[PDB]
Design a protein around this ligand. Structure first.
Ligand SMILES: COc1ccc(C(=O)Nc2ccccn2)cc1
Ligand SMILES: *[C@@H]1O[C@H](CO)[C@@H](O)[C@H](O)[C@H]1NC(C)=O
Ligand code: NA
Ligand code: NA
Lengths: 28, 11, 250
């Protein structure tokens, strides 16, 4: 779907979940 | 253990 | 999930619970990939060594859940299955190679704050993100320890492990259709899937487009969160041509 992978309560509102940054920091 | 689900889903 | 934490509300809106009708119980995790298709592990549906071979009418999927055991009125949606599709080369005899299955729902599920599909990776996102040390996220309602059960959906972030280390951790033959993840004994941090988590998703958030992609399916592990062992995951991208073929045809 065109809208896949974008969570209504997070990405769609520009809110970050508590641990997603841990993932980002590993993508080195 | 699990709460019963509505009967409509079991028919 | 061992050594995870409680999920936030709406954190994993693609998470699906595979639920046995009778007796009413959790069978496996799964994931929502469109309004009518759910992805899981083949061994959740078919595993002859354990006399497991479910038919559509045996099962339900529960979508939008947070609580493990509660009926989440006005939030979760419960769907019946139209058809199960098992990968034709799923190897239940040996090592769970190609541990993947699709379930088509009888009716489309309505999306909501709690229900939303995950993306499947393209070749480039897979090549970029499936690298040792890069972390993904595993979610499920499985046991909290190998040897108990969570109130709500659990989450843990785990690093992908180098293939030689995966292979050297086990006597099972590891294939290109699998990858492994978890911390090493020396890394201090811990975590794994466990009983009841299988079939659920291993996801990564692309730093390129800020979307969540399902890179793996929780497939198998020898114990849960054992030192020197790793969890094994079905390599979704490697099997994506089959997924597309099923969805295109049916
Ligand atoms: C990474 O995927 C999984 C999937 C399943 C398991 C699992 O249930 N292990 C287990 C449970 C009891 C006894 C022995 N081993 C672990 C990781
Ligand atoms: C599983 O069940 C289906 C339908 O009942 C059957 O046709 C199929 O051969 C079974 N597969 C195995 C491996 O037993
Ligand atoms: Na080995
Ligand atoms: Na381990």
């Amino acid at each position: 779907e065109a809208d896949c992978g974008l969570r209504p309560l997070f990405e769609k509102k520009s809110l970050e979940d508590k641990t997603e940054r841990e993932l980002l920091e590993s993508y080195i | 253990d699990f709460e019963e689900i509505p009967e409509e889903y079991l028919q | 999930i061992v050594e995870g934490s409680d999920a936030e509300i709406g954190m994993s809106p693609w998470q699906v619970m595979l639920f046995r009708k009778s007796p009413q119980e959790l069978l496996c995790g799964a994931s929502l990939i469109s309004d009518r298709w759910v992805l899981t592990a083949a061994h959740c549906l078919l595993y002859p060594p354990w006399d497991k071979n479910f038919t559509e009418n045996d099962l339900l999927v529960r979508i939008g859940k947070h609580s493990r055991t509660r009926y989440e009125r006005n939030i979760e949606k419960i769907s019946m299955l139209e058809k199960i599709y098992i990968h034709p080369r799923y190897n239940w005899r040996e090592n769970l190679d190609r541990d993947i299955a699709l379930m088509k729902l009888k009716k489309p599920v309505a999306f909501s704050d709690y229900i939303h599909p995950v993306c499947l990776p393209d070749r480039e996102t897979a090549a970029s993100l499936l690298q040792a040390g890069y972390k993904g996220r595993v979610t499920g309602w499985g046991n909290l320890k190998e040897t108990g059960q969570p109130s709500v959906l659990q989450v843990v972030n785990l690093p992908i492990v180098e293939r030689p280390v995966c292979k050297d951790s086990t006597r099972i033959r590891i294939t290109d259709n699998m990858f492994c993840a978890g911390y090493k004994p020396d890394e201090g941090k811990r975590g794994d899937a466990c009983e009841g988590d299988s079939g659920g998703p291993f996801v990564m958030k692309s730093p390129f487009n800020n979307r969540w992609y399902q890179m793996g399916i929780v497939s198998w592990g020898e114990g849960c969160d054992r030192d020197g062992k790793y969890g094994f995951y079905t390599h979704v991208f490697r099997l994506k041509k089959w997924i597309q073929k099923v969805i295109d045809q049916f």
